[PDB]
Amino acid sequence: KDTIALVVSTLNNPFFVSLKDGAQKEADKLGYNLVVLDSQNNPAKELANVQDLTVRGTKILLINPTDSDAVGNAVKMANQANIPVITLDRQATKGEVVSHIASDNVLGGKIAGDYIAKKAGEGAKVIELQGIAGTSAARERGEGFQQAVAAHKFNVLASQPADFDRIKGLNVMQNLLTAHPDVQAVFAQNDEMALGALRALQTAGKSDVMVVGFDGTPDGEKAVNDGKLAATIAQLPDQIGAKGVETADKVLKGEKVQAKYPVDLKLVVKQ
Ligand SMILES: O[C@@H]1[C@H](O)[C@H](O)CO[C@H]1O
Structure with missing residues (x-):
C-alpha cells in the first residue's frame, strides 16, 4: 500500500478533525495508507514532521500550513525529496505545490x-x-x-x-x-x-x-x-480532505490536475 501523509496545523479544532476524517474516508476507499501528523500550530514542529516523513516512504504530502510564509522551508524539503505537495485550506507562499484546495x-x-x-x-x-x-x-x-x-x-x-x-x-x-x-x-x-x-x-x-x-x-x-x-x-x-486524497491519487496515477480546486x-x- 502506498502511503499518503496528512500534516494538519492542529487537531484541537473540530474543523481540522472533520478535514482529517474526510481524508481518512477517501484514503480507505482508494486503498491508501494515511499517516496523520499534528503540527500543533508550531512551524518548528511542522518542519520536523515533514523531515520525518521524507524518509518514511511517503508517496504524497497533503499539508495544511501552520503559517503560509514560514511553511516554505518545509515545502522545499519535500521538493528536494521528490515528494509531490498538495496544500489544503491554507496556501504556501514559497515552494513547489502541485495543487491547492x-x-x-x-x-x-x-x-x-x-x-x-x-x-x-x-x-x-x-x-x-x-x-x-x-x-x-x-x-x-x-x-x-x-x-x-x-x-x-x-x-x-x-x-x-x-x-x-x-x-x-x-x-x-x-x-x-x-x-x-x-x-x-x-x-x-x-x-x-x-x-x-x-x-x-x-x-x-x-x-x-x-x-x-x-x-x-x-x-x-x-x-x-x-x-x-x-x-x-x-x-x-470533509470535502477538502477527500478532494486532497482524490487529487493525490490522480497525481500518483500520472494524471494531470488543476492547480486550484x-x-x-x-x-x-x-x-
Ligand atoms: O479554514 C480554516 C478554518 O476556518 C479553521 O477553523 C481555522 O483555520 C482556517 O484556515
Missing part, C-alpha cells in the same frame, strides 16, 4: 460583513476577531471583510487576532468589551473564536450583540440553531 475566503469575509449590514444596519459598530496572522485564510477573510466595511460604512471599534482559538477568543473579547461596550456586531473569523466571544458576552450580560462565525462546525451550527450565533459561513472540511461556501442562518 480551499474555500474562497475573500468571498467568505465579504458575505459575513454583508449579512451584518443587513441586520445591524449600515454604519454599524463592529469588532473583528482575526485568525492566526500569517495564514492565507485569516489574511483573505480580513480583505473580504474590509470590502464590506467600505461598502457599508462600518465603524470598526477594534480588530485583533485570537488565533482561531476558543479560549483566546473568549479572553480577547472580554478585554475588548470593557473598552468598547457600544459594540453592535462581531465578525469572528472562525466558529471556535465565535463561540468564545459568545461566552464572554454571556459572562458580561450582553445579549444584544450580533455574532457571525465561519466554518459551520457542529458546535457552530448548533449555536445558530439555538439562536445564540446569528450566522456562520459553512465550509466543507475551489470548495463552495454557504451562509447558514436559523430557519
